[PDB]
Amino acid sequence: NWEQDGLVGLTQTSRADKGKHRIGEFWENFITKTYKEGNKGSKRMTPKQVALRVEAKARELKDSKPPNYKTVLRVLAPILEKQ
DNA sequence: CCGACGACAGATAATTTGTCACTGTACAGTAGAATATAGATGCGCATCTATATAGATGCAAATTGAGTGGCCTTATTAAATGACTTCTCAACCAGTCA
């Protein structure tokens, strides 16, 4: 590793899944769209309100294990940060 | 015989997700509203115009009444009618007769 790369070959290497959520792609897109749509024009929707919409979709899909509030805050984290 | 690399299997923290406990912060009457501007539209009042004159005047026929100018056989007699003029208009004495 020190032959094929610099001192960064003898530091640790971070995992490939760092910054990817383990929840299903449907849920990550649902949370992303729900937040963005909830803010069109004058509306101002908080992550907690998004989490309630997640729970409402979970009842429709009969999903016994939807993303919880902390997972919604993490999914929206970079979206709030860029801003 | 020694060193380096790949296959397969095994153990491991980073990553993501979930749960749990402590916490900063909004709820407290409140931004639709004030103050300029241009730009278009409409009602009112004045200021012209173009038409429409009837009354007055000048003139030129069209008679119309009122003028004026130019052209014409004559002399005797007789009768008739109507007129004019002139003249005249004494009175008793002297000589017969039945």
Nucleotides of B under 7 A from a protein CB: 14-20
Distance, angstroms, CA A45 to C1' B77?
Answer: 180
Distance from C-alpha of A52 to C-alpha of A67, rounded to nearest angstrom: 10
Count of residues in chain A = 83
**Which nucleotide is closest, CA of A3 to its C1'?**
B4
**Which nucleotide is closest, CA of A13 to its C1'?**
B14
Angstrom resolution of this structure: 3.0
Approach to solving: cryo-EM
